[PDB]
Swiss-Prot record:
This is Fibroblast growth factor 1. Belongs to the heparin-binding growth factors family. Pfam families: FGF. GO terms for molecular function: fibroblast growth factor receptor binding; growth factor activity; heparin binding; integrin binding; S100 protein binding. Heparin binds at residue 22.
Length: 141
């Protein structure tokens, strides 16, 4: 392993919003594949269904569009139409409270799913342990 194995409680039984306390944005995947953050709780593209491939590995799927969150070769997030190597994330507990999502594909490089204070996605190589941008809170829909 390149990472710890502290796992969050809860589960995947229900769909959820992914809230980033950094700037106070909900993760969003627009129909066209664009990934970003919004503070609009009424948005119809911020609801996700998580599922586990293996213990600690998850897919993050848009309930509205069916797209999978994915991180490409350059660390950019995009909505994938199908489940590929780039759609698997290591879900871990962080600071004994939050959830972090590390790209399985690029785990050795410590690339996390994260949002900047202005709501834009932080590129993989620009993220790292210790940042507030990588800290998520799953909220019921």
């Amino acid at each position: 392993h390149h990472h710890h194995f502290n796992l969050p409680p809860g589960n995947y039984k229900k769909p959820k919003l992914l809230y980033c306390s950094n700037g106070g944005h909900f993760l969003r995947i627009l129909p066209d594949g664009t990934v970003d953050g919004t503070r609009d709780r009424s948005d119809q593209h911020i609801q996700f269904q998580l599922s586990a491939e293996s213990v600690g590995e998850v897919y993050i799927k848009s309930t509205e569009t069916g797209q999978y969150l994915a991180m490409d070769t350059d660390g950019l997030l995009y909505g994938s139409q199908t489940p590929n190597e780039e759609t698997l994330f290591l879900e871990r507990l962080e600071e004994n409270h939050y959830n972090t999502y590390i790209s399985k594909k690029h785990a050795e490089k410590n690339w996390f799913v994260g949002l900047k204070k202005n709501g834009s996605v932080k590129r993989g190589p620009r993220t790292h342990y210790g940042q507030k941008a990588i800290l998520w809170l799953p909220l019921p829909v």
